[PDB]
């Protein structure tokens, strides 16, 4: 129904600078991660290189924002890249040179924005492109982000509000942006979902003339706005910021369950970025510092398995150049990636005693089953073929291990350690 669905026919795959560099990534870091993606990941689908929040804040140095500071901005109230961090942006070029470089690697370019219009623009009353009202005249008088001071909300009832958002996506299209992650929009402790700005952004993107995939943040996303999200966004965060802590991974199981009927071509509920590999380099969030992910290998596989079968977008959050062989292997298993790319219909078959099973299928007769022990004790997790809707015996294969398991006549059953999972393909017997 919505043309923009065609811009994300499978769930977006890429890298995002937040978990490794907070608000502070530099051009060289972005390029290095892009070069890695081009070389090792791109043939497996990984394509977006996304500069996360506050690329317009020259003094950013962490995940903790420096409040009330000046921001780089053009003459039409539009935030611009900090030239110290992004030297190719010198001379008002913005992100075009960086985006060109990324496109020349065969990749796509993404940016984070904060909902609204900068506070400094509203206080100074700087101009808006394409109208003779000033920034001050389109601001909401009662709309802020509770955890960041950069912006005020834009009031869609005001003349010039749509013009401002149109002008942002003109700029981003000029730069060659392919993806935008809009933040302080899905959930807010003070205000709830900013629905009207979502609609203004949808319209701005549709007018700018370029395919720009729309990601919305942060969660938890209310189901009450399911129709709005499904129709307007290509991806939307189910949860608040995800980190390498078991408790947050445990919690994702329920959110997937809650959102599974709204997953479909072009509109992807988002389990958030993958905190794998080397993270916390200039981020202090998640209760950690400079580290390798604190998820155990079992937890890492559990996460990948759930995000894969659910069909979350996959946005790697570590510094890619520091990946070891293990970490790279989580990204490049063709059999596993078939479930994400070509599976559909994912659903929770059951959840009982902290054992969970999910299943999906492809168009070729295969059924995929992800079985999870999300308890604190080792245990056998099982599911009958009848509960999967398989009426005959099936061949089983462990997709992560790439290992035939033989014929299964009645049930699948595996001993799984705490937080451990397995992903199995069932197919018709020979």
């Amino acid at each position: 129904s919505m043309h923009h669905y065609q811009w994300a026919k499978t769930p977006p795959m890429g890298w995002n600078s937040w978990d490794c560099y907070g608000a502070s990534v530099t051009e060289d870091e972005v390029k290095g991660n892009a070069e890695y993606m081009a070389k090792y990941l791109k043939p497996f689908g990984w394509e977006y290189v996304v500069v996360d929040i506050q690329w317009y804040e020259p003094g950013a140095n962490s995940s903790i924002y420096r409040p009330f500071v000046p921001l780089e901005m053009d003459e039409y109230s539009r935030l611009m890249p900090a030239v110290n961090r992004f030297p190719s942006a010198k001379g008002g070029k913005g992100f075009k040179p960086l985006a060109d470089y990324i496109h020349n690697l065969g990749l796509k370019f993404g940016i984070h924005i904060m909902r609204g219009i900068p506070r400094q623009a509203v206080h100074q009353n700087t101009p808006i492109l394409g109208t003779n009202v000033g920034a001050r005249d389109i601001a909401d008088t009662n709309s802020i982000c509770p955890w960041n001071t950069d912006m005020y909300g834009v009031d869609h009832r005001k003349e010039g509000a749509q013009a401002y958002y149109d002008s942002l996506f003109q700029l981003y299209a000029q730069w060659g942006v392919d993806f935008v992650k809009v933040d302080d929009i899905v959930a807010s402790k003070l205000y709830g979902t900013h629905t009207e700005e979502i609609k203004m952004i949808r319209k701005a993107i549709d007018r700018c003339g370029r395919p720009i995939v729309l990601s919305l943040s942060p969660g938890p996303a209310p189901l009450d706005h399911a129709t709005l999200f499904v129709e307007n966004a290509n991806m939307w965060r189910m949860t608040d910021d995800f980190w390498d802590r078991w408790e947050l991974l445990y919690d994702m199981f329920e959110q997937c369950y809650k959102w599974c009927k709204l997953v479909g071509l072009g509109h992807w509920p988002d389990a958030d970025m993958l905190p794998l590999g080397h993270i916390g380099i200039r981020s202090v969030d998640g209760g950690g510092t400079d580290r390798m992910t604190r998820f155990t290998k079992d937890e890492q596989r559990t996460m990948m398995t759930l995000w894969i079968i659910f069909r979350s977008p996959l946005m790697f959050g570590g510094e890619l150049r520091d990946n070891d062989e293990w970490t790279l292997s989580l990204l490049t298993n063709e059999e596993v990636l078939h479930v994400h790319q070509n599976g559909y219909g994912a659903r929770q078959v059951y959840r009982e005693n902290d054992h969970v099973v999910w299943t999906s299928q492809d168009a070729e007769g295969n059924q995929f089953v992800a079985m999870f022990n999300i308890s604190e004790k080792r245990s056998v997790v099982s599911v009958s073929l009848k509960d999967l809707g398989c009426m005959e015996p099936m061949k089983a294969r462990d997709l992560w291990a790439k290992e035939d398991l033989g014929l299964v006549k009645h049930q699948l059953a595996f001993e799984l350690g705490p937080h451990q999972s397995i992903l199995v393909k069932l197919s018709p017997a020979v």
Copy 2:
């Protein structure tokens, strides 16, 4: 496995005794409505004859309950039909004779039940079939319905709880019940959604060996439980009790918008019963008494048109034998019903200035467009073919009037009075 979806491949259509007779319908009134349906309505899909709440309360005489009164019940804590109101239930036969009669007319039989176990069973500690525990041992000590005194909630953690629900659906299956409307389960001012009982009921149905369509009430249904409802129920009420008042009809537009992505084969968000024809005979609800519906003809058409394109179940709430020719005409237009039976993908194309357009399609390429003026002022309501996704000129037909309208080149546009609508079919031009 959602095998129960197959029991409601299209949204259930039928008649329900609440709006005309409150809690107090008699066997004769049910039979008469069933005979009418067999004769005039069955070829158009109308098939369920549903006895609404409190068939077990011999003194019921209104929509206002008589609180704390004795209820008709068997020896296993199961409510039974009141023999004074349902004479064929003499001798412990329950509803089997009535259901047989209804089946012999080529129709299906439905009943209303209240969640839980009767308070009188708990207080007397009457037995539960198939166990040695008593009613008192399975009751929740803190679960009531705030607007009816008949039951206490059942506690799924107690031994015997599932046995009790299993026993209910064994009885209903013995009677030949094809449809159950379970109340005090979706929403509750005191407790929210009774999720655990929904699951016990799903299980009891699945175990009883007969196809029984599951309807849940009352709304508003939380979007947060969309997965649970979609997987467990065939229909669930979006709203608190719907009545012949413009305000409630106006409000339904938003609920349909909220629920539209969860509508699909086997699982139907429910806009509630149609307060058409002669209602309020022994009901005082909705702010009215014995009357013909207070919806104007335009309003009645507006309602039918929205429920049709949305694919709400259609449960007629008036005393059918008092239909006039106008009222019957709302129920026997095959061209309109096709949109309900075979349409899919219904969505709100836009809502602006209290003008609303919805569209859906069938697999044969027809596009259906419902255009609504829900404002207080006459106006032209229009929509471009482009916004419908039609890339060239089309022919249009008014489905209610059964009248070709000719070619449309750029936009559909009609003058519509306040609260008036039209339903149009678009197909390729010659």
Copy 3:
């Protein structure tokens, strides 16, 4: 002091209550034994109420955990009655009169717990109401229960006969000689909030019954939003949910006292709940414990007594009195401390900072009382200046619990206090007095 019933509780009620020791299950013999102990060791210090707590009408009660949907003992007018197995003197329809007589003969007063409403078994049978032709069924609220007890349904004040039922209850209680009623499921409720209309019906029933009956309301937390209602209708009302011998609950009470201090006055006492001292949990499993001596340390026990004393909470001892040791009894028989509860007024939090708190009050003879508390986890000096107390000159100081003169204080009071430890001090004039 507009309301006549204020005169029935000029000082905050003091007594004993069966809940913390015996749950819902106390017997006549236990009640009498605690009364006898009170008469002989406590009565000269103001302890006078002997309160039979919840479910004296439930013959099979055996714990603090209620046995749901069981038969209850009741008369022919929908009124609950004492279980005769547990209260043998109630045989022959006499109810509590004999037990109350016995208590009155000791020079004490008698109290009972009731649950708001009318028994569900009355409403379902539709049993009669004294003094009217409507039945129990016709006065019940169709949407009013207690979420943690199944005995009753609420009564709907709009229905004819509702007031007659409550009047009839207090006619019964007056006939028995009841001097005190603790009405439960009325102040707070997870489902419904405060049952204001029933509070008013009960005020009226009491006023009509012709006997002075002190009205206690339970359970908390009491909303400040209903401060006026509570102040004008009740003699005491619970500030908190059930209090037990856990430091965390005692720590929390400091804030609730702060919140309620301006509504404390003659006849109308915010209630910090019963004192879980001595031997408790005999047939109670609440509070996370079983049969035990209170888990409060001695310091905690003093800290509790000190706050309740200066605050002017009602004092309802919750342990089985006959098992008191010397230490426990000493908490109850210090006249110098009790003077602060009986004759103090104006109690206020002077400050709270770094988990140090100081409260002060005074009497009409110009003595000033100061309670100082370390509610942190570390030993520390807690101090307060005379200026902050409003004392303009040097004062003599005395440690009321220790009964020990501390000498002259020129500028400030200051004491090293262990974690959870407190002190209660009296300040009186030095200028103008001999040496």
Copy 4:
């Protein structure tokens, strides 16, 4: 008894406030004209505060609707200052000292409105805080705004300098001669609830400034949960959101008085808000009205005065005084009625039933005051027994507004009262 600042408001403050007539936009000449009126006609009856309401620091203010995000008049120490265009005597950095001097010379007292916090522009420019090496930006809360005005950010009491900033504000206000401050965005907030920590900083700043400054808090509804806090820190606090000349809001006040009546006492006055009487809405558009005489009927006006009087709310006239008619003035100059406000105590609701309400209070000479109200839509007799008043014998009765003896009353007071009409009666011992 305990708090020294109670002695600065031994009776409930009485005065005039510019909001209901001039919104945010009053001028020096308008203030001075109202003050002159007060001095001439009102001062002998207790009216003494002349209060300049919100946004005296916003030079372009022109209504009750704020002009968001505009630059504000401010000194080098992040402190808002009077707009010299509106207050010409403030020229040359003198602030409100000349105006306050003029007012004091009339035998009156001077009040100002402030918004909680520190100005956004000070935080963005990081202007200094007097007496310290920190800046405004170092003391601001990053998640604390007013939802209905854009001028300030909240101050974070945990930060070094925070107290110094509020101390500096009250040093300025004391230098000017301020005698009363109304602090807004502090009692209630849709986003954040009661700003309890800033109330305590303000209490402390006032206590340190060396001058008696009566502390009024706004806006309501004030939560009873914070009764202690308000009673101990403030001289008055708003029970309600902004009160206007609409029956519905007057009707609602009866319940708020009932809820707050036990916390009324010397020095600490729950506040039923300003009196929308006389000529209001001159440059205000709030309350659903424009330039007008109050839409309260005479009966409603009396009913309001009567409740505020017996309850002992502060009395802050909100109209342009110079346009009073003889009627309006009469509501302010009845000494017999005012005695109930000045010397009454113990006010309580005797009952409320069928939209009839009776309040009573007394004085120390044993007079008893009874206010009887018909707040229904129908004419009716409203009565109350002497027994319910606690009068154990017959009493003389006098209608205080009419100044008319009514004779001996043996058993009950009873009067036929129109809808929204009331009466105020004094009962005193017979012979």
